[PDB]
Design a protein around this ligand. Sequence first.
Ligand SMILES: *[C@@H]1O[C@H](CO)[C@@H](O[C@@H]2O[C@H](CO)[C@@H](O)[C@H](O)[C@H]2NC(C)=O)[C@H](O)[C@H]1NC(C)=O
Ligand code: NAG
Ligand code: NAG
Ligand code: NAG
Ligand code: NAG
Ligand code: NAG
Ligand code: NAG
Lengths: 256, 360, 50
Amino acid sequence: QCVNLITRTQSYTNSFTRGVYYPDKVFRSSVLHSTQDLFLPFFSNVTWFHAIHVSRFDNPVLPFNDGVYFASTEKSNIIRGWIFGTTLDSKTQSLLIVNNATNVVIKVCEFQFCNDPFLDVYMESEFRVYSSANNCTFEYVSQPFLMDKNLREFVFKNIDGYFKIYSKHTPINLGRDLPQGFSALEPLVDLPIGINITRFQTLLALHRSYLSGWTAGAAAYYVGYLQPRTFLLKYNENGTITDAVDCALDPLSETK
Amino acid sequence: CTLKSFTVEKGIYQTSNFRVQPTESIVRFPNITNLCPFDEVFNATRFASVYAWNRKRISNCVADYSVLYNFAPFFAFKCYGVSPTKLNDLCFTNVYADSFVIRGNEVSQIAPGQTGNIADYNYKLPDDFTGCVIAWNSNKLDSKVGGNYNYLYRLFRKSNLKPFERDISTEIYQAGNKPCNGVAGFNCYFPLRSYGFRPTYGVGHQPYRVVVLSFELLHAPATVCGPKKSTNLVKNKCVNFNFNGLTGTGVLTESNKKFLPFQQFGRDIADTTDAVRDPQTLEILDITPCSFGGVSVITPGTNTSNQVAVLYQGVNCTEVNVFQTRAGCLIGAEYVNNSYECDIPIGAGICASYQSIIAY
Amino acid sequence: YNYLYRLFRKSNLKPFERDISTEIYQAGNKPCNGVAGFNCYFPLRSYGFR
Ligand SMILES: *[C@@H]1O[C@H](CO)[C@@H](O[C@@H]2O[C@H](CO)[C@@H](O)[C@H](O)[C@H]2NC(C)=O)[C@H](O)[C@H]1NC(C)=O
Ligand SMILES: *[C@@H]1O[C@H](CO)[C@@H](O)[C@H](O)[C@H]1NC(C)=O
Ligand SMILES: *[C@@H]1O[C@H](CO)[C@@H](O)[C@H](O)[C@H]1NC(C)=O
Ligand SMILES: *[C@@H]1O[C@H](CO)[C@@H](O)[C@H](O)[C@H]1NC(C)=O
Ligand SMILES: *[C@@H]1O[C@H](CO)[C@@H](O)[C@H](O)[C@H]1NC(C)=O
Ligand SMILES: *[C@@H]1O[C@H](CO)[C@@H](O)[C@H](O)[C@H]1NC(C)=O
Ligand SMILES: *[C@@H]1O[C@H](CO)[C@@H](O)[C@H](O)[C@H]1NC(C)=O
């Protein structure tokens, strides 16, 4: 039941100082800690994707590189998860992350993914996400991380067998979607997956019309790519990352 | 001994290091929950036939062999490649549980290097099998007076089975030269024969339920590991602590530091652990290392006297003629309110002299 | 089957130490009391040399 329904346009914006996450689970108070990790660089070129379904294949699979920064100002029901893998077919293992109103299901199987995967609500069906799923080796159901103006930021990393997901929800006063200031991303899950991930794709939800089989919809999201970078994070009295400098951005920050 | 001489000149000599020995070991390992469903496999109401033996993969849970040991009816608990005693500590990546029902006489056939009907045609183990075989009597669950005809086995097959292979085919066995054409008769037999279990059979023929646990390691990180015992928590003493694989030795005092929910450990400015969150009860503890000190010996010349005093540098007097100085705890010298010139320097304005040994 | 090895022992041996004691080992919570039976096995097993 693989059908091509989503068209996607792309623009380029500035990251500002978004995308900082907690590099470990260690409490540090009132210190300056320099860490080298996969970070989204400050004021980096971030691609803003507008995905529109109106009631041909124009929604290609994006590379994963060393990890992905994802952001959205949209509500929790439109964007419903992601797809990770290399070939996205039955010959290699793949990871499917699907969120719904009650929980999140993260599941690693041999999915034969569709070219234009989307979750359709009618109850929710994954037959437009994949056509088959065999030799399934991992399943993990837990509390959802797309809950309810609110900017939602995620960091996906695939390091030495573990798929690490970091997240944050920030109430942004009406204005520029990527705001100024700092909001560090808390560690959400470390999954013992052990698969090769080189490509990724975003899952959207489409509603049946009951009257052009699916209702017309739009989703805007920001994608940036993590790079091996050294950051200097400021930990305040209560252990919160309130500020950071990118060591390789400019000579002043390099001096810092 | 330190000065490598039999005569010691007057002065203070740093000779040893005082330490507070660890008293207890506190191994607060992570809260053990979500153990592997061995109750589903071993205590199932319905098992499978040996030709269509049931295989369940086991991953991402706490392997636990306590339950197996508790069960008394087991006729064989023979293990291959790993010891039964060290099942709970040595850990593996995937565990395969194979369940079936056979007759008692054939339980010896469930082993590497064996031959028989079950080994050749129903269930074969490789010669390098790493795992355990478990079998138990099941008269109360699998024997019927009329005869239980729901358990089957494969008696005829063209070639022997490969290790960890199943055959659920119902093709008529062609033993001769003529084609069977799907109809039984002479030289054409149905391969699956029924295990007609009855309660009055001899011990070699009563139904035995067998579960074979096969352990495998791959390049993936091993995620089926046995429970690590979490002992009670002791505070305010020098105890060797093992918290979630982070090891050390120190006092665990109450902490006023409010950790965020995602944080587990805590570090100093100089990247040394100063705090930790207990994984059993969500409380914050101030890890403070046990007291240590530089033991210094204050003595006059051996020509004059053999009396000595001991200074524990940096050690409070309650943690070891006992006097408390800012330098440390001085034992063996009596404080005198008189002031004299410095003879043996102690520190922080305190000096020692011989007149007994006095400190002033 | 003339060559036997000690599969089970309470503790590891010392260097250049020989153990020839044919006493039973307790592998479980239940005591064995010197008699073989369920989950009570002899420590010394023979090699199947062919
Ligand atoms: C949201 O997703 C969860 C996860 O699949 C659904 O919960 C499952 O529902 C099925 C119904 O067939 C049950 O068999 C499972 O036991 C449920 N699993 C868990 C972990 O609860 C849930 O129904 C979904 N909700 C909606 C509205 O689609
Ligand atoms: C971002 O990339 C696009 C093309 O990928 C380029 O045209 C644009 O100049 C870049 N933005 C900046 C600020 O350099
Ligand atoms: C994958 O599935 C196919 C059939 O679905 C099977 O033949 C193959 O052995 C399976 N591989 C693994 C590693 O499970
Ligand atoms: C992961 O997949 C890519 C693309 O197929 C391949 O080039 C790379 O070598 C793979 N990595 C590993 C470790 O197999
Ligand atoms: C830190 O915590 C204290 C007490 O919980 C609170 O009063 C204070 O506002 C917090 N933030 C800073 C920056 O001190
Ligand atoms: C089976 O049931 C008994 C009943 O008391 C229970 O003690 C045991 O833990 C269960 N599981 C196994 C694996 O024996
Ligand atoms: C940890 O173990 C204790 C033991 O009583 C239990 O009460 C508690 O629910 C467990 N979980 C957490 C998160 O503390």
